[model samples]
Target: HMLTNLVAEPFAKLEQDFGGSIGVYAMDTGSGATVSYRAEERFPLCSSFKGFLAAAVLARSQQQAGLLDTPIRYGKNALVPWSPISEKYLTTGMTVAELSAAAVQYSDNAAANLLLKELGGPAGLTAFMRSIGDTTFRLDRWELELNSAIPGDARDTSSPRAVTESLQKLTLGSALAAPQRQQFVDWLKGNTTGNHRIRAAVPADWAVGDKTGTCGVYGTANDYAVVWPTGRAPIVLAVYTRAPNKDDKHSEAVIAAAARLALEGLGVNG
Candidate 1:
């Protein structure tokens, strides 16, 4: 079957390449052609959940005037290890929108936590997920430590299918509380991270916006994105793998190749 060749085989190869496990979910936004491999399985969300954080912030912005423009003050307790861009804002204050930019664009952990706290931290995210009727992913805890060890069961988790649905909300204008959904997508596009993951193997002319997650764990590399192939239907994809090198060129090549195969399955390149 074409589905077997397109989704199954490529994912199987991804597992072999990563020396661990992989799960993928892809959708052709127009025709509704969909592919899922081990989509039910869950993995730690890492920074992949950051986009949702922005969603939560946007939702609050609508309720509170100047929420996005209001300056955020970071104390020592607000600071997390990584996030040089957001960390610098500790001394000089930046608005909520600026913090959102840092959290979304650079995956700044400190800024993420700042938003997390603004939204009531993990509990707030849980409430947001509940409001959206999303049960596939759990936004547990706050900022992560890349250099330190975190016990597996305590981390944030998500499934391939779950991540796919979240992307659908973003692309369909159903993610945020309305109006600023595109604005949220703009924040995602400004993201200065994850060029090697979902954006790697797509057509040069195509536009892609994604959120990526890379943790200190040995087996967690995550990316979820929306791809608009020039003159073609948009594609929402979620790819998860374990034990892949975060920055190794060859490791990233494997991810790019997987994305290429998923796009090929859409028959747009045929």
Candidate 2:
């Protein structure tokens, strides 16, 4: 409730700065579980879906049944330079771990597509989601390039509630074993960007690992994160939004404000 009010003030400010529809969803993963507010209610996953895919990959890895340390070759046909993986200094072959990091940290489309392929395509990812108990999550089409997909409509999908649940599982080590969980957390720490939501709101000294998704044309931006504050309960937060512009600065401010409110509600020091 406090977060809702806190965001309302900023929503108004955002509206005044940019005229267009805005949709926002935010959740707190700790004791005071709350979905502060939502607008438009339904929005496509955009690049945020990659985070889920990353989780699926990790979960599958735990089974020793999924592809791990698998070396995937990259060429123009399968790899594109715009992708971070393609842009990397090394080019002969890369492991699944490297690909996952590029996908999440850089939001590399080629890396995500490659990982999807290694996981046995969209069907494999779908099965993984079901195994993790996320029934409502769905992909409209497989192999739809993130940049080329149509926007302003639900394509690949998720809800604030579902995303929060996924993050909770990851944070609590339900998604992967301790070592694998630590690996995921480490990948997040190496994330190259922090100008988006979730990370923006967290203190620099705080242990925060997150993935941010954005579709510039449609103004879709989302972030899922696990925050570990020393001497306090860790919190999982998912913030999704669609705005008129891809304003990372504004997005960061909103996320920080929401985090402050959520922490306050949970009796955690802001």
Candidate 3:
């Protein structure tokens, strides 16, 4: 408890300056040391949930031999704003694996929705989280709608602690089969959206795989990643932020700063 408070103090000040609440959870896989600041508190998951969505797809693909190769054809109605990758492939249609990569790399709305429908919607994704021993995660709604990020609403939220633990399990632990786990890591490593978030906090030489979420409302946005420092064990961490006001803006810089602090707390110097 004492160690937790010592690390938590800096985060409280960071959030105070940003005029919002920040939740961070970082774990050093080698030492089993954790830095938790508002970690147990719920914050909107936003598009960050897409990473787990991809992992769920991988998990199911293990039993279904052809699941990854099967081409998925969706109608125009499925398309949603901010679906940059999916929109481009609408005419030709893409395979399930492609959609999963789009969701993780580009945070493609249509790809996520199509994949969600395949898994049986939000409840299905929630069930996958439960299967992996993560009770803190919940995805009650779809994209665009879920990004409302209303303060105090638990509709689409999870704690930072839960995000990091689940990511660790899927990436470095055994929740995912060997092959599927590597595929999951590959998609995250190819992510085009998180350059300024957790990715910005780590050293240039470190290998990192990350996913980012920006609700574009109420200052809700987040980033989580699995970082491999030279010669040491990987570190898995999550940084999430939400301001009280609906119009309050989220700062990528703040997320990066919070991530640096989290690594510092874990004694993993940049």
Report the number of the highest-lDDT candidate: 3
Cα displacement (angstroms), candidate 3, residue 252, comes to 0.1
**Ranking by lDDT, best first?**
3, 1, 2
**Model 2 CA lDDT for position 219:** 49
When 1 and 2 are scored with lDDT, the better candidate is 1
lDDT string for model 1 (151-193, tens) is 3453577788778887787557465755778878788777778
Q: Each candidate: what lDDT?
A: 0.74, 0.64, 0.93
Ranking by TM-score: 3, 1, 2
Candidate 3: lDDT over CA atoms? Answer: 0.93
The candidate 2 region of ten consecutive residues with least summed lDDT is 1-10
lDDT of 2 at 64: 70
Q: List the residue pairs that clash in candidate 3.
A: none
How far out, in Å, is residue 192 in model 2? 1.2
lDDT of 2 by residue, 88-192 (tens): 634687778778888878887778888887678777777877777877676655444543324455557667667767667775647678877787788877777
RMSD of each: 3.2, 3.8, 1.2
Candidate 2 residues lying further than 4 Å off, grouped into runs, are 1-32, 142-144, 147-152, 244-267
Better candidate number, 1 or 3, judged by lDDT: 3
> For model 3, how does the per-residue alpha-carbon lDDT over 173-235 read when each residue is reduced to its tens digit?
999999999999999999999999999999999999999999998989999999999989999
